[PDB]
Amino acid sequence: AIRRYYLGAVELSWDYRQSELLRELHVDTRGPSVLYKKTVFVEFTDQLFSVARPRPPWMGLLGPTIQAEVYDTVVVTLKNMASHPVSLHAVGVSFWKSSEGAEYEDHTSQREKEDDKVLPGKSQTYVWQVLKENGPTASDPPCLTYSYLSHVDLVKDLNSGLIGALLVCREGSLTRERTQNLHEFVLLFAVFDEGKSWHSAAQPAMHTVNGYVNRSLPGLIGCHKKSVYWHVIGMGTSPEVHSIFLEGHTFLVRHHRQASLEISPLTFLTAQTFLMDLGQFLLFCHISSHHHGGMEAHVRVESCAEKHPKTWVHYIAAEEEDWDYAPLVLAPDDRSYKSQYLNNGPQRIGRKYKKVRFMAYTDETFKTREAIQHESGILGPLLYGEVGDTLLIIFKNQASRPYNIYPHGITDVRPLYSRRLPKGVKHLKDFPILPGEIFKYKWTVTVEDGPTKSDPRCLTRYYSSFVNMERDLASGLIGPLLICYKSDKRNVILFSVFDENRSWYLTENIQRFLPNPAGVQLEDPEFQASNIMHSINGYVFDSLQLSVCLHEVAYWYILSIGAQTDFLSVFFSGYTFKHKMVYEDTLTLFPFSGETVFMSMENPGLWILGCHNSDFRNRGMTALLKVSSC
Amino acid sequence: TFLVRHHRQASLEISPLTFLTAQTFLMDLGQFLLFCHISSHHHGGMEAHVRVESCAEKHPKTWVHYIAAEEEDWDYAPLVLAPDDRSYKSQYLNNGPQRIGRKYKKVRFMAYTDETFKTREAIQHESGILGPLLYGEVGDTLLIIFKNQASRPYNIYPHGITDVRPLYSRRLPKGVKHLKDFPILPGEIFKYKWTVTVEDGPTKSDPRCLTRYYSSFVNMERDLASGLIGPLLICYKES
Ligand SMILES: *[C@@H]1O[C@H](CO)[C@@H](O[C@@H]2O[C@H](CO)[C@@H](O[C@@H]3O[C@H](CO[C@H]4O[C@H](CO)[C@@H](O)[C@H](O)[C@@H]4O)[C@@H](O)[C@H](O[C@H]4O[C@H](CO)[C@@H](O)[C@H](O)[C@@H]4O)[C@@H]3O)[C@H](O)[C@H]2NC(C)=O)[C@H](O)[C@H]1NC(C)=O
Numbered sequence: 091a092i093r094r095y096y097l098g099a100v101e102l103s104w105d106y107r108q109s110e111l112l113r114e115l116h117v118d119t120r121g122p123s124v125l126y127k128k129t130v131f132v133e134f135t136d137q138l139f140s141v142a143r144p145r146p147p148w149m150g151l152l153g154p155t156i157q158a159e160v161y162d163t164v165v166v167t168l169k170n171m172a173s174h175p176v177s178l179h180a181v182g183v184s185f186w187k188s189s190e191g192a193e194y195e196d197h198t199s200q201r202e203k204e205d206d207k208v209l210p211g212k213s214q215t216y217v218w219q220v221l222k223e224n225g226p227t228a229s230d231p232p233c234l235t236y237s238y239l240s241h242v243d244l245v246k247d248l249n250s251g252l253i254g255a256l257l258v259c260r261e262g263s264l265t266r267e268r269t270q271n272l273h274e275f276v277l278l279f280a281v282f283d284e285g286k287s288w289h290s291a292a293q294p295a296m297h298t299v300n301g302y303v304n305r306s307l308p309g310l311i312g313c314h315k316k317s318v319y320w321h322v323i324g325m326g327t328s329p330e331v332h333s334i335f336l337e338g339h340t341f342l343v344r345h346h347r348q349a350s351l352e353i354s355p356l357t358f359l360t361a362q363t364f365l366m367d368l369g370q371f372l373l374f375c376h377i378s379s380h381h382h383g384g385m386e387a388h389v390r391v392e393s394c395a396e397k398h399p400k401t402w403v404h405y406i407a408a409e410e411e412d413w414d415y416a417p418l419v420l421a422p423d424d425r426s427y428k429s430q431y432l433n434n435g436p437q438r439i440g441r442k443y444k445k446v447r448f449m450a451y452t453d454e455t456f457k458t459r460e461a462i463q464h465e466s467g468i469l470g471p472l473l474y475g476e477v478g479d480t481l482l483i484i485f486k487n488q489a490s491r492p493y494n495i496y497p498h499g500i501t502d503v504r505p506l507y508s509r510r511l512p513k514g515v516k517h518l519k520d521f522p523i524l525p526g527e528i529f530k531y532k533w534t535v536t537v538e539d540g541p542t543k544s545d546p547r548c549l550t551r552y553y554s555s556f557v558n559m560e561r562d563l564a565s566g567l568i569g570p571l572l573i574c575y576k577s578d579k580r581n582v583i584l585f586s587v588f589d590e591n592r593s594w595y596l597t598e599n600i601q602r603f604l605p606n607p608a609g610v611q612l613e614d615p616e617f618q619a620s621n622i623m624h625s626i627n628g629y630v631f632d633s634l635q636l637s638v639c640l641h642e643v644a645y646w647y648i649l650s651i652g653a654q655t656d657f658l659s660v661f662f663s664g665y666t667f668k669h670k671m672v673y674e675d676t677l678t679l680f681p682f683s684g685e686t687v688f689m690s691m692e693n694p695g696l697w698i699l700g701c702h703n704s705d706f707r708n709r710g711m712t713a714l715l716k717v718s719s720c
Numbered sequence: 721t722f723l724v725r726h727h728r729q730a731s732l733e734i735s736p737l738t739f740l741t742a743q744t745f746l747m748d749l750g751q752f753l754l755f756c757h758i759s760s761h762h763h764g765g766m767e768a769h770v771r772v773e774s775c776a777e778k779h780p781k782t783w784v785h786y787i788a789a790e791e792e793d794w795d796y797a798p799l800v801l802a803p804d805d806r807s808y809k810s811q812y813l814n815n816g817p818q819r820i821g822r823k824y825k826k827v828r829f830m831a832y833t834d835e836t837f838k839t840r841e842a843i844q845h846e847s848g849i850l851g852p853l854l855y856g857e858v859g860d861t862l863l864i865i866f867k868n869q870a871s872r873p874y875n876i877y878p879h880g881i882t883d884v885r886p887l888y889s890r891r892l893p894k895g896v897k898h899l900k901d902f903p904i905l906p907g908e909i910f911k912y913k914w915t916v917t918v919e920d921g922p923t924k925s926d927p928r929c930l931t932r933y934y935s936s937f938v939n940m941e942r943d944l945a946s947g948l949i950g951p952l953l954i955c956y957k958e959s
Pocket residue numbers: 105106107124303304384
């Protein structure tokens with residue numbers, strides 16, 4: 091029907107960590123530091139605006155979360171009690187330009203510019219219509235995730251805290267079904283720039299979930315063997331992206347099995363997550379800045395009241411190896427780029443570096459390697475398993491440091507004979523394997539691990555070493571893993587900036603490749619530039635070269651995994667490929683996320699496999715792909 | 721499981737002034753019923769909860785069995801050994817005014833050869849009534865393709881193995897707290913993955929194999945009484 095909401099821009103002091111500075115956002119009737127001045131949306135219950143409704147602890151600075159279903163009119167009343175002017179712009183629903191809330195040259199009456207910018211002390215009704223075409227489209231979820239926000243100075247209004255959730259829903263908002271069994275929650279992945287808010291206009295970038303930083307944020311509880319539905323809003327006033335993982339868990343956005351959850355300002359998702367594991371799981375942003383960290387927040391699950399598989403055996407070894415990214419085929423020059431990065435210089439390792447990597451072997455002897463195929467370059471062996479199959483990973487460490495082999499995207503991994511982790515260890519992916527030793531891993535592919543009838547027949551995933559995620563990956567430990575449903579040359583591409591300055595072996599390479607190992611400046615910022623190899627599979631600059639038969643109708647499992655922090659927009663110079671049931675011609679990949687694009691080779695030149703993000707291209711990140719007939 | 725003296729024990733056998741030090745090890749978060757299991761539900765105050773909680777700081781075979789719950793006429797005494805009778809024998813095994821006697825119709829577990837359940841694997845005299853011998857060393861997996869074929873909804877679940885999920889999925893079909901009490905219907909088939917882990921197996925100090933059993937659990941009492949029972953060994957690696 092009709093829906094009345096009373097909001098009110100309230101100024102508050104906020105430290106991003108203590109849910110107790112929320113109580114000040116209540117209302118009348120009648121250390122340790124940091125603390126910033128902010129302003130938020132608070133509900134009220136009267137039009138007198140003397141009755142607050144309490145801020146739920148888990149919402150943080152989020153606004154009161156207005157809901158209406160289709161055909162409902164929404165009446166909302168701002169009251170600007172903040173130092174500054176505010177507004178109330180809705181995304182997702184109909185207005186009339188006086189219940190809009192942004193000012194521009196719209197050739198409208200001066201009272202149709204009261205919505206546009208309300209003033210301190212003042213107040214303003216708004217009227218939003220949920221039209222018949224405002225709603226779910228059937229193939230969407232029962233509710234759509236949107237947002238109101240103050241809209242007089244978008245940079246300041248967002249960074250000050252004026253945002254809240256807004257859910258247009260089908261008919262049957264009120265239907266009721268699973269009383270807090272199926273939990274909905276609002277997750278506002280947002281970067282509040284406390285330096286670019288109405289306050290002090292040298293300050294800091296807060297990377298928050300609902301306004302909390304470091305694993306604060308009470309209240310994210312979920313009933314055990316049931317689903318939880320996240321309503322997702324990204325937010326910021328600069329670009330920035332976030333990869334949002336949940337430990338032990340995959341999401342379900344559209345009707346796809348998302349494992350990454352890829353977000354940017356004003357991304358609006360409804361993701362579903364089935365919970366089948368008691369305990370605590372970390373919801374966090376995987377971008378290697380930890381400046382993009384701080385977006386961490388615990389998620390407790392608790393228990394509330396009321397054609398026959400194959401087993402794949404693998405003998406993988408972490409073993410060290412001279413490796414060069416320009417495999418003595420790249421003719422150099424003397425100017426720069428491919429000469430600073432490659433080309434053994436006086437203060438430059440050049441192009442040959444000591445790496446460690448996963449390698450296949452035929453039996454437990456580890457005394458004969460296996461096939462190779464040089465297309466899949468630095469990569470470890472290719473690991474496959476349809477839903478229902480087990481993977482037996484007999485892993486020997488033949489290198490110096492302790493290393494590891496853990497799957498990303500398999501959930502049910504444990505040692506082969508017992509479910510009991512060893513020694514003092516709390517989780518296998520922390521449990522290091524000392525040089526010389528074997529460990530036997532069992533990777534069990536369940537159904538919630540893989541394709542959903544609506545996404546590919548093979549989800550592209552990686553494995554790697556986790557005793558030191560970042561540096562082990564740098565050092566060369568990475569491998570493709572496919573997780574299919576129920577046949578090809580195979581085709582795996584991995585865009586990997588290999589930050590050799592993190593490589594455990596940089597110390598060895600420094601000695602074994604500079605002529606001045608004695609006198610080396612480890613912080614010459616182009617010396618370290620000389621060691622970021624912007625690599626496709628193994629090789630920088632067109633050293634990689636794919637040969638596919640003309641007409642060979644392919645299948646490309648691509649991944650962006652490496653020192654990267656920016657999303658890689660990625661192309662095949664000549665072709666289009668079939669992605670998520672449509673064709674595209676750019677495939678965007680956030681860090682640590684792989685996609686499967688199905689391609690048919692038919693026009694027949696020699697093209698260029700490359701990113702799109704120019705300043706990566708000019709530092710190597712380029713393959714070749716020649717097609718011709720046969 | 722309980723570890724006592726140095727043996728994996730499933731129950732604690734106790735009685736007036738019995739004294740033990742048993743230790744157990746907690747891999748699954750949750751709440752589990754500690755309880756005395758004697759058929760006489762009076763024995764049924766001995767029931768306490770234990771909550772477990774996070775705190776602070778050669779190659780293993782896969783065995784495949786096609787098993788059917790299915791009804792048959794069961795004979796308790798198919799061997800002509802009657803005469804001896806100034807001693808009870810008559811009462812339990814004669815027909816007339818109000819004795820079924822000795823041929824009761826029961827339902828058993830019965831091993832078949834494939835998903836078709838149209839042909840039976842090898843029976844064997846001596847184990848009569850009890851379902852097929854289900855072996856499994858530490859590390860192995862048992863695929864229990866189960867098909868019903870009876871006149872009540874039954875089920876098959878092993879006491880002995882911790883890790884018994886459905887095959888393929890790890891999540892249970894309906895508002896099902898537990899695969900143990902979830903029933904199987906018309907002649908539906910369910911496919912289970914029993915995985916024998918170390919903490920199910922013997923302990924150096926006890927035998928190569930240790931003796932367990934499976935049964936329908938939709939109603940433990942009357943199902944087992946109808947005859948849904950069969951043996952499960954759990955053993956160690958390297959007539
Ligand atoms: C959630 O957790 C993360 C990660 O731990 C925190 O991120 C840290 O951010 C702080 C800065 O905000 C850093 O750690 C601390 O930095 C302070 C110094 O850095 C700033 O300090 C002055 C303050 O005037 C600024 O002008 C200057 O430009 C710097 O930016 C210190 O106050 C801290 O104390 C240390 O300083 C000296 C050591 O010589 C001693 O007095 C102390 O012994 C102590 O060591 C500390 O260094 C750092 O950037 C981040 N930490 C890490 C590990 O990366 C978030 O702040 C946190 N969220 C909270 C707290 O809400």
